[PDB]
Amino acid sequence: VSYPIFTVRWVAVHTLAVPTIFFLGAIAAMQFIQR
Amino acid sequence: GTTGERPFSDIITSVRYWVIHSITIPALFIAGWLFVSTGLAYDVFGTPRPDSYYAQEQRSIPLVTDRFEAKQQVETFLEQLK
Amino acid sequence: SANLWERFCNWVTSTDNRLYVGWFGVIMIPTLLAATICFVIAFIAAPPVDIDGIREPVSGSLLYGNNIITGAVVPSSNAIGLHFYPIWEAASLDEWLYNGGPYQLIIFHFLLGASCYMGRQWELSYRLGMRPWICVAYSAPLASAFAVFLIYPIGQGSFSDGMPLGISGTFNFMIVFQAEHNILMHPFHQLGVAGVFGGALFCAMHGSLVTSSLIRETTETESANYGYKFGQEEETYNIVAAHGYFGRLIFQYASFNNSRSLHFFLAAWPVVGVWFTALGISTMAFNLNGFNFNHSVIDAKGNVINTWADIINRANLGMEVMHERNAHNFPLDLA
Amino acid sequence: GWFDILDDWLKRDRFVFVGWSGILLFPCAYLALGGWLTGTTFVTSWYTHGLASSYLEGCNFLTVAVSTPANSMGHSLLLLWGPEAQGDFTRWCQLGGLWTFIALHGAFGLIGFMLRQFEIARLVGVRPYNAIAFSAPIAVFVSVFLIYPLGQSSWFFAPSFGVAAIFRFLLFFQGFHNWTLNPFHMMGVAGVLGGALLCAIHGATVENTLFQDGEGASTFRAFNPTQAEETYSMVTANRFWSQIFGIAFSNKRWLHFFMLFVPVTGLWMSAIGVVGLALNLRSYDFISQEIRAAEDPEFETFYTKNLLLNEGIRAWMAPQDQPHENFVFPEEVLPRGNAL
Amino acid sequence: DQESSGFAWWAGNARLINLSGKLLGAHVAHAGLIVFWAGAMTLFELAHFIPEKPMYEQGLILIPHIATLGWGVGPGGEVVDTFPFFVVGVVHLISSAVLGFGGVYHAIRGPETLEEYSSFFGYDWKDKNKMTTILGFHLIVLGIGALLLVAKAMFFGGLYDTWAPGGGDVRVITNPTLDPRVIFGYLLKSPFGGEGWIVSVNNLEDVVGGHIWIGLICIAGGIWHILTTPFGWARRAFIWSGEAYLSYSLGALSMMGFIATCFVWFNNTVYPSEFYGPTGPEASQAQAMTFLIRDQKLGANVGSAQGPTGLGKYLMRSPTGEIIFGGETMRFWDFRGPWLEPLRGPNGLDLNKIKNDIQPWQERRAAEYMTHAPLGSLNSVGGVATEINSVNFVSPRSWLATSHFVLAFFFLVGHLWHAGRARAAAAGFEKGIDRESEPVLSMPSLD
Amino acid sequence: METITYVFIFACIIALFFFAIFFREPPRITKK
Amino acid sequence: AELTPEVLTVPLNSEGKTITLTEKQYLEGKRLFQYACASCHVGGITKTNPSLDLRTETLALATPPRDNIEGLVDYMKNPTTYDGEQEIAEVHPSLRSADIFPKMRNLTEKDLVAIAGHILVEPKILGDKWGGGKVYY
Ligand code: CLA
Ligand code: CLA
Ligand code: CLA
Ligand code: CLA
Ligand code: CLA
Ligand code: CLA
Ligand SMILES: CC1=C(/C=C/C(C)=C/C=C/C(C)=C/C=C/C=C(C)/C=C/C=C(C)/C=C/C2=C(C)CCCC2(C)C)C(C)(C)CCC1
Ligand SMILES: CC1=C(/C=C/C(C)=C/C=C/C(C)=C/C=C/C=C(C)/C=C/C=C(C)/C=C/C2=C(C)CCCC2(C)C)C(C)(C)CCC1
Ligand code: OEX
Numbered sequence A: 001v002s003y004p005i006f007t008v009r010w011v012a013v014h015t016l017a018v019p020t021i022f023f024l025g026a027i028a029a030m031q032f033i034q035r
Numbered sequence B: 001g002t003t004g005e006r007p008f009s010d011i012i013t014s015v016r017y018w019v020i021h022s023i024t025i026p027a028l029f030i031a032g033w034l035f036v037s038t039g040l041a042y043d044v045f046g047t048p049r050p051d052s053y054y055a056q057e058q059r060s061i062p063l064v065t066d067r068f069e070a071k072q073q074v075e076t077f078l079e080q081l082k
Numbered sequence C: 001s002a003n004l005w006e007r008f009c010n011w012v013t014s015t016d017n018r019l020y021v022g023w024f025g026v027i028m029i030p031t032l033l034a035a036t037i038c039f040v041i042a043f044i045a046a047p048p049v050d051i052d053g054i055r056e057p058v059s060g061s062l063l064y065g066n067n068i069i070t071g072a073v074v075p076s077s078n079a080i081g082l083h084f085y086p087i088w089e090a091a092s093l094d095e096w097l098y099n100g101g102p103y104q105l106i107i108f109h110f111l112l113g114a115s116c117y118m119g120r121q122w123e124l125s126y127r128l129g130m131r132p133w134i135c136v137a138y139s140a141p142l143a144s145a146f147a148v149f150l151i152y153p154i155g156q157g158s159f160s161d162g163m164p165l166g167i168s169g170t171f172n173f174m175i176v177f178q179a180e181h182n183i184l185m186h187p188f189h190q191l192g193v194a195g196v197f198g199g200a201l202f203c204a205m206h207g208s209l210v211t212s213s214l215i216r217e218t219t220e221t222e223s224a225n226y227g228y229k230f231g232q233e234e235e236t237y238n239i240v241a242a243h244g245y246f247g248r249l250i251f252q253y254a255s256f257n258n259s260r261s262l263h264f265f266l267a268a269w270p271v272v273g274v275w276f277t278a279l280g281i282s283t284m285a286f287n288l289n290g291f292n293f294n295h296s297v298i299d300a301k302g303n304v305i306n307t308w309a310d311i312i313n314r315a316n317l318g319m320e321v322m323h324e325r326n327a328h329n330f331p332l333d334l335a
Numbered sequence D: 001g002w003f004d005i006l007d008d009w010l011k012r013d014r015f016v017f018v019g020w021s022g023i024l025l026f027p028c029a030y031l032a033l034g035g036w037l038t039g040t041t042f043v044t045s046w047y048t049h050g051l052a053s054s055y056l057e058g059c060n061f062l063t064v065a066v067s068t069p070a071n072s073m074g075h076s077l078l079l080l081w082g083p084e085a086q087g088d089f090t091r092w093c094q095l096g097g098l099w100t101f102i103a104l105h106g107a108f109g110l111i112g113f114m115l116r117q118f119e120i121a122r123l124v125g126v127r128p129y130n131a132i133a134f135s136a137p138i139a140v141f142v143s144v145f146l147i148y149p150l151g152q153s154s155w156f157f158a159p160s161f162g163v164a165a166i167f168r169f170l171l172f173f174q175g176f177h178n179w180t181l182n183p184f185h186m187m188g189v190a191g192v193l194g195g196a197l198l199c200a201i202h203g204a205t206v207e208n209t210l211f212q213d214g215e216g217a218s219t220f221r222a223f224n225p226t227q228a229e230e231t232y233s234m235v236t237a238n239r240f241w242s243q244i245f246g247i248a249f250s251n252k253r254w255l256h257f258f259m260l261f262v263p264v265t266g267l268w269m270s271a272i273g274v275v276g277l278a279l280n281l282r283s284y285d286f287i288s289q290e291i292r293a294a295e296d297p298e299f300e301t302f303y304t305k306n307l308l309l310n311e312g313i314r315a316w317m318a319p320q321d322q323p324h325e326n327f328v329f330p331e332e333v334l335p336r337g338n339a340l
Numbered sequence E: 001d002q003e004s005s006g007f008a009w010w011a012g013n014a015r016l017i018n019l020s021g022k023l024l025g026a027h028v029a030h031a032g033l034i035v036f037w038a039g040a041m042t043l044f045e046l047a048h049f050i051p052e053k054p055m056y057e058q059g060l061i062l063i064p065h066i067a068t069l070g071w072g073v074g075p076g077g078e079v080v081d082t083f084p085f086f087v088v089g090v091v092h093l094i095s096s097a098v099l100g101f102g103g104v105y106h107a108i109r110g111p112e113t114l115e116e117y118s119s120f121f122g123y124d125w126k127d128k129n130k131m132t133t134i135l136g137f138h139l140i141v142l143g144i145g146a147l148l149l150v151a152k153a154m155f156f157g158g159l160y161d162t163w164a165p166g167g168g169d170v171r172v173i174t175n176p177t178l179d180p181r182v183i184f185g186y187l188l189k190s191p192f193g194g195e196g197w198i199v200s201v202n203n204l205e206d207v208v209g210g211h212i213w214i215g216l217i218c219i220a221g222g223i224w225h226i227l228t229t230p231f232g233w234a235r236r237a238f239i240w241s242g243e244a245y246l247s248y249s250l251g252a253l254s255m256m257g258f259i260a261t262c263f264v265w266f267n268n269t270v271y272p273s274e275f276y277g278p279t280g281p282e283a284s285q286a287q288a289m290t291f292l293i294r295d296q297k298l299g300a301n302v303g304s305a306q307g308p309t310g311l312g313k314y315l316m317r318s319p320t321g322e323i324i325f326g327g328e329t330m331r332f333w334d335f336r337g338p339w340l341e342p343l344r345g346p347n348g349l350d351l352n353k354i355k356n357d358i359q360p361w362q363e364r365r366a367a368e369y370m371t372h373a374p375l376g377s378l379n380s381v382g383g384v385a386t387e388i389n390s391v392n393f394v395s396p397r398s399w400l401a402t403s404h405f406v407l408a409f410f411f412l413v414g415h416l417w418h419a420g421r422a423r424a425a426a427a428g429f430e431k432g433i434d435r436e437s438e439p440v441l442s443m444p445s446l447d
Numbered sequence F: 001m002e003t004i005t006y007v008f009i010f011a012c013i014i015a016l017f018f019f020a021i022f023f024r025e026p027p028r029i030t031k032k
Numbered sequence G: 001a002e003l004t005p006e007v008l009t010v011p012l013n014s015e016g017k018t019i020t021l022t023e024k025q026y027l028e029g030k031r032l033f034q035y036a037c038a039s040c041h042v043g044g045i046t047k048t049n050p051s052l053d054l055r056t057e058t059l060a061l062a063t064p065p066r067d068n069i070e071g072l073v074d075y076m077k078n079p080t081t082y083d084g085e086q087e088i089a090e091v092h093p094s095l096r097s098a099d100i101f102p103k104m105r106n107l108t109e110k111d112l113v114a115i116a117g118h119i120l121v122e123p124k125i126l127g128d129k130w131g132g133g134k135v136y137y
C-alpha cells in the first residue's frame, strides 16, 4: 500500500516521545550534580 | 484489522527512519542535558540550587504566609541571599 | 460388602457428595471445625489476655466490654514466645485463657485446614477431569495467612507479634508494622496494592465489558439475566463486539480478543501481586525493611532538606514511640 | 454542513480514536500527565512545604511529588494570571500552581474520558456499562482531591501528587481521622479486596475448566475468536465450586454483572466516608468505650491501643507536616512510652 | 527439530522432556552457571574483603561459608590467610568453563537423543529400573560428599568451633557422635520454642557425627536402588512421568529451603556469629546484657530492680522458673551463646556471676552484637526503619534468610503447579475437558 | 443487650449459610 | 548556604588556639566517622550509653576537656570516663587497644584528627540534631 507519513498517530506519538527523551536527557545530567 | 497509518514494524525497521532518528533522538537528549547542566532549569522553575535553601546563618524556612502578597513575599525571600 | 475399607475410600473420594469431603478433607473438616468452634467461643466469652507478657491483660471478647469492631482473639503471651502451648501444657484452663492459649489452637488448626483446603481444590479438579492450578491461585491468599500468622511470628521470635483475630486488632498489626518496617516504602507491598487495585480494576473492566456486550434475548421489561440458560452451547455475549469497543477506547493492539489470554491475565495479575505482598511480610519478618531515605537530600552546607519520606518518618516515630507503652526497658527495639 | 463534515472527520476510525470527546480529553489528559512529569523533575516544594520534591533537587521516583500549594493560598484556583502568580510562571511554580493545574485539568480529563466511553459505545452500538463502572474512580478523585480539601482550610491538606506524598496522606488519615475505623472505608476495602478476589478466582476457574479445542499443550492458540461454542465448561465449573465452597455461579450474565457491582460499589462507599472527613465528621471514637476507660484504668482493648498510636502520630508529625502553624513541641510534652 | 508444533516459546524447555541428549546439555550447562557464580562471586567478595574488619559488615556470604570449614581463620575468627579464599574461588570459576563446554556441546552438537548413541546413558521416564538406578548413582555421589566434610573435619584441618574451650577457634573433631539415639534424636525433636529440631544442633561433634550417618545411609540407599525396582505400593501410589519426577524434587527443595532459612536465622554453631552477624535473639539478649552491665556499675542491684510493670527491669523468670533477661527479651530466653554461657548457672543466669564475674571481652561482645542486630532496609541502612543514614549495613543472616524463603516458597508453588499437571497429564486431560465425553455430565445431579 | 444483638445477627448469617447451600434452587441444565 | 572555611574553623587546643580544616579533611573525617564510630555514635548519640553524647557542650564539661582537636585525639588513644578517673580502653575502641578493636588498626594520626574535626564541625552544621536523638530526626 502507499502509506502516508505525517498522521494523527504520528502527532500523538511525538507529543509523548519528544518530551520524554528531552527529560531522560535532563535527568541523566542530574546524576552528576553535587555539593 | 488495519487502518491508514503505516505499520510501526515497517517504520522502526526502515533504514530511512534511523537515518533520521540517529540525529533527532540524540539531539533532544543533549538538549535536555544542557537544560540542566547550564543551570537554566533552576531559573525556569525557581528551583533552589544546593547552596540556595537557606541563608548562611539562618535555619528557618521561607514559608509563604499570605496569598495576595505571596509573589512579593517570595522575592523578599530571595533577597536574603537565599 | 465388597470390602469395608474399599467402600470407605470410595465414599470419601465420591464425586456424588453434596460437599466433596476428600482425602485432604479428612484432615481439613476436623481441623476447621476445631478452629471455628474455639474462635466463636473465644470471641464471645474469653477473658482478657496478657499478650505482651508484662502482666497487662487485654480484653477482646464481647462479654468483656467489646463489640464486633473492637473485639478480637488476643495472641498468646510474649512470655511464651514460640513455645508450643497446648491445653495440656497448662495447670488449668484459667491459666490457659490468661496466656492466650486459644490463639495457638485456632491459628494452627486454621493454617492446617486452610492448607488442606488448597489440597482439596486439586483433588476435586482431578476427580472431575478438569485442569488443576485453581488451587495455585488460592495459594496466594493462603501464603498471606501463613505469612501473617506463622512466618512473621517465627521471624520475630514470638506468636504475640502475630496478627490478632479481630477488626481493630488487625489495624494494630498494620500501624505497628509500618512503624518498625516502613512497609509503604517496600516494593513487595507496592506490588501488592498493584495487584489488588489492578484486580478490582480488571474485575470491573471485564465485568462491565462482558455484561455490556450481551446478545439481546430479553424483553424491555424483563431481567437481562434470564437471557441465559444454565448449560448453554454457544456464548451469551459478543466478545467480538466487546473487543471492538475496548479496542477503540485505547487502541486495537492494547485490547484482548482471545478469551483464554484474557482470563489468564485476569487470574495472573492479582495472584502474582498478592504473592509478592505475601513475600513482603515474610521478608520483613527477618527485618529486611522498606527503603530508608531519611536525611538523604542535603544542601551544600550539610543542612538536611526534608522530603515526603521524612514526613513519613515522623509519623512512624509517633507509632514506634507510643506502641506497647510499658513493654520496653531499653533504647533499641530489637524484638 | 460543516458540522457533519467536522463530525465525519472526528468520528473516523483511526489508530487512536479522537471523537468529540477527544476535544476535551486529549488536551487535559496530556497537560495533566505533562504537568506531573514536569514538576516531578524540575519544580520544588521549598517555598510551599519546605520540602525537596524533584529529581533536580535529588529526589527519587518514590520521594518525588507535585506538592499542594501553601495553606496561605486557601482554596484559591491559583491561575497563572491570577492575583497570586500575576502572570509570572516561575512564581506560579514556586507557589504550587502546578497542583491546581494538574488537579483541575486532570479532573476534566476524567470527564472527557468517560464521555469517550459513552461516545465510542454509542458508535459501536454496545451498552454503556463501561461508563457506569468508571463512575467509581471519578467519585474517588472528586471526593479526595477536590471535595475533601474544600472542606478543610485549604488545598494544602489535599493529597499531593507523588508516591511518598500519598503514603503520608494515608498515615495522616490514620493519626487524625482514624480512617481505618470508618465503616464506609471498611466497605471500601471489602469491595476492592473482594473485587481482586473475583478477578483472580474467575480467571483461574475459566483457565482450568476449558474444553480441549487443540492438540497442543499451550491451549491459548486453541481459541475461536469468532464466538460459537463456550470455550470453557460452565457446567463443570458450577459442580466444582458447589462441592468445595458449597455455593457456585450458574448464570454468566449475573456472574459478570457481579464483577461490575462489587468493586464499583466499594469505591463509592469509600468516597462517602471521605466526603464526611471533609467536615471532619469522622468515625474516630466509641463513646461507650471511652467512658469505661476513664473510670476504669484496667480496661484495655485493641481499640484503646490504636488511639494511643494516633496521639503519637499527631504529636510527632504535626510540626513538620503543618509548617504554617509554627508548632513548637518541647521534648517534655511529647507523649512517649517507656525507654522508647 | 522442535518448534511451535510441540510447545509455546514461553514453555520452550518443555520441548526437551523427551530429548535425553539435549536435556543433558541443559543440566550440564546449568550446573556450570552454579559453579560460575560460586567462583566469580568468591573472587568478587575477596576483591572487596577488608581483613581488619568484621565479615558481616562487608556483605559476605561465601567467604564466611569457607571460614566455617576452618580455612584462613584462627582465634576468635581472626582472618589469617586469604589464599584459601582465592583458591576456592578460582578453582570453581575454572571448572565452570569445563562444565559449560559440555553443556553447550550436548545441546547443539552432540546427539539430540541418547537411547541409540548409548543404551547405558539413554533413558526412559517410565523405566522404573533406569530411574531408580540413576537415582542410585546420585545417591552415592551425594553420599561421598557428606564424607568429604567428615574428612576435612577429622583429618584435613577441622572446622571453626565458636564453642571452643579457650574461645572460638579452628578445632579438629576427633570424637564424632555416632550414637544413633542421640543423632536420630534430633529428628524427634519439636520444631517450636526451646526444642528446636534440626536447627537445635549446638556442637560440631553431632554435626560431624550426623554427617557420618548420612554419608553411609545415603550410599547404602544408593546401592539399594541400583540393585532393585520400586515395589508394589510404590508403583500404585506415585505417578511415573518426566514432569512428575521433577515435581517430587521441587517440593523437596522447597522444604529444604525453609529449613535453611531457619538455620541461618537461629543456629549459632554451623553459622558462627563471628563470620555472619549475631542471630536475632542474640542481639536482643546483648542489649539486656549491655545495660545490665552498665547500670550495675552505676551501683544498681540488678537482682531486685523493679521495672515499670513490676516484672524485673534486668532479670526475671521464665514460665518454668529459670532466671532470664528482662524486657521484651523474655521471648529469647532460649538463646545460647559462647559469650553468655559462663554467666549461666544450673537455674539460669546466676546473680553472683552477674555481680562480679562479668569479663571485659563479654561486655564489648554484648556491645558489638547489640549495635549489629539483623535490622536494616532494602537500600542497606542499618537500624530501625526510623534510623538516619550513616551506617551502611544489613546482616548476612537477614539477606540469606529472606532470599531463601522467597525461593523456597515459589518452589512450593512450582511443586503444586508441576504436580497438578503431572496428575492431569497422566490421566490425560491436562489440555482441556473432552467436548464429547464430559465426565461431569455423566454424574448424577446433587442439586 | 449489645452482645445478644451481635451474636443474634451472627447466628442469623450462619443460618442463612445453611439454607443457601442445602436449600438452594437446583441448577437445571438446558431445559430451564 | 555552603560549607565555608568559616564553618570549618574549630578549636585546636584548650588555650583558645584554633585550626581550620579543609573540605578534604571533613569528607575524610565523615567517612572515617562512619567506618569506626557510626556503629554506636550515629547522629552524635551513644547507643550503648545514651547518657553521654557528642555535643560540643557535653565534651566541654568533660574531664579532661574533650571539646577540641587535642582532647578528642587523646581520647581516641586513651579513652576515660567523664571524670577521667578511670581508663576504659578495654571496652572502648582506641589505638592502645587496636588488637581488640581491629577497625582502629588502620587509623593513623591523620585519621584521628579528621574524625576529631568531624565531631566538632557537625554540630556547627546540624545544630540540635547532632546532639538529640529520634526527637530531632
Ligand atoms: C478544551 C481544553 C481545555 C480546557 C477545558 C481547559 C481548562 C482550563 N485551563 Mg487550560 N489549556 C489547554 C486546554 C484546556 N484547558 C491547552 C491546550 C493549554 C496549552 C496552551 C492550556 C494551558 C493552560 C494554562 C497554562 C492554564 C490553564 C488553566 C485552565 C483552567 C482555568 C482556565 C480558565 O479560567 O478558563 C477560562 C475559560 C474560558 C476562557 C472560556 C471562555 C469561552 C467563551 C465562550 C468565550 C467568550 C469570549 C468573549 C471575549 C467573552 C465576552 C464577554 C464580555 C463581557 C467581555 C481550566 C480548568 C489554568 C489553571 O489550571 O489554573 C490552575 C492555567 O494557568 N490552561
Ligand atoms: C528445578 C526447577 C524447575 C524446572 C527444571 C522447571 C522446568 C519447567 N517449567 Mg517450571 N517452575 C518452577 C521450577 C522449575 N521449572 C518454579 C519454582 C515455578 C513457580 C514459579 C515454576 C512455574 C512454571 C510455570 C508457570 C510453567 C513452568 C513450565 C516449565 C517447563 C517449560 C520451561 C519454561 O517455561 O521455560 C520458560 C522460561 C521462561 C519464560 C523464563 C521465565 C522468567 C522468570 C519468570 C523471571 C525470573 C525473574 C528473575 C530472577 C529476575 C531477573 C532480572 C532480569 C531483569 C534479568 C519446564 C519443564 C511451563 C510448562 O510448560 O509447564 C510444564 C509453565 O507454563 N514452570
Ligand atoms: C539455564 C538456561 C537454559 C538452558 C541451559 C537451555 C537449554 C536449551 N534450550 Mg532453552 N530456554 C531458556 C533457558 C535455557 N535453555 C529460557 C529461559 C527460555 C525462555 C526464553 C528458553 C526457551 C527455549 C526454546 C523456545 C527452545 C529452547 C531449547 C533449548 C535446547 C536447545 C538449545 C538450542 O536451540 O540451541 C540453539 C543455540 C543457539 C542458537 C546458539 C546459542 C549460543 C550458545 C548455546 C550459548 C553459548 C554459551 C557461552 C557464551 C559459550 C561458552 C563457550 C565456552 C565453554 C568455550 C537446550 C537444551 C530448544 C529445544 O527444545 O531444543 C530442541 C527450543 O526450541 N529453549
Ligand atoms: C540468591 C542469593 C543471594 C544472596 C543472599 C545475596 C546477598 C548479597 N549480595 Mg548478591 N548476587 C546473587 C545472589 C545473592 N546475593 C546473584 C545470583 C548475583 C549475580 C547477579 C549476585 C550479585 C551480587 C553483586 C554484584 C553484589 C551482591 C551483593 C550482595 C550483598 C548485598 C545485598 C544487596 O545490596 O542486594 C540488594 C539487591 C536488591 C534489593 C535486588 C532485589 C532483587 C529482587 C530479588 C527482584 C525480585 C523481582 C521479581 C523477580 C520480579 C519477577 C516477577 C515477574 C515474573 C512478574 C548481599 C550479602 C553486593 C555486595 O557484596 O556488596 C556488599 C554486590 O556488590 N550480589
Ligand atoms: C552430567 C555429566 C555428564 C554425563 C552424564 C555425560 C554423558 C555422556 N557424554 Mg559427556 N561431557 C560432560 C558431562 C557429562 N557427559 C562434560 C562436562 C563434558 C565437557 C568436558 C563432556 C564432553 C563430552 C564429549 C566431548 C563427548 C561426551 C559424550 C558423552 C556420551 C558418551 C559417554 C562418554 O563419553 O563417556 C565416556 C567416558 C567414560 C565412560 C568414563 C569417564 C570417566 C571420567 C574420566 C572420570 C570422571 C570423574 C568424575 C567427575 C567423578 C566420579 C567419581 C565418583 C563417583 C567417585 C554420554 C551420553 C560423547 C558423545 O556425545 O557420545 C554419544 C562425546 O563425544 N561428553
Ligand atoms: C533423596 C533420596 C531418595 C529418594 C528420592 C528415594 C526414593 C525412593 N525410595 Mg528410598 N532410600 C534412600 C534415599 C532415597 N530414596 C536411602 C538413603 C535409603 C536407605 C535408608 C532408602 C531406602 C529405601 C527402602 C528400604 C525403600 C525405598 C523405596 C523408595 C521408593 C518409594 C519411596 C516411597 O514410597 O516413600 C513414600 C513414603 C511413605 C509412604 C512414608 C511416609 C512417612 C514419612 C517417612 C514420615 C513423614 C515425613 C515428614 C513429613 C518429614 C518429617 C521428618 C521426620 C523425621 C519427622 C522411591 C523410589 C522403597 C522401594 O520402592 O524400594 C525400591 C523401599 O522399600 N527407599
Ligand atoms: C506543565 C506545563 C505545561 C506542560 C508541559 C508538558 C506537556 C510537558 C510534557 C512533559 C513530558 C511528557 C515528559 C515526559 C517524561 C517522561 C519520562 C521522564 C519517562 C521516563 C520513563 C522511564 C524512566 C521508564 C522506566 C521504566 C518503566 C516505567 C517500566 C519498566 C522499565 C523502565 C525502567 C523502562 C505547559 C507548557 C503546557 C504549560 C505550562 C506548564
Ligand atoms: C544451552 C543454552 C543456553 C545456555 C548456555 C549456558 C548456560 C552456557 C554456560 C556457559 C558457561 C558456564 C561458561 C563458563 C565460562 C567460564 C570461563 C570461560 C572461565 C574463565 C576463567 C578464567 C579465565 C580464570 C582466570 C582468572 C583468574 C584465575 C583470576 C583472575 C581473573 C581471571 C578471571 C582471568 C542459553 C540459555 C544461552 C540459550 C539456549 C541454549
Ligand atoms: O510486640 Mn508489638 O511491637 Ca515487634 O516490635 Mn518489639 O515486639 Mn513489640 O516491640 Mn515493637
Ligand SMILES: [Cl-]
Binding pocket: C172, C176, C322, C323, C324, D305, D306
Ligand atoms: Cl500498641
Ligand SMILES: [Fe+2]
Binding pocket: C206, C210, C263, D202, D206
Ligand atoms: Fe469471564
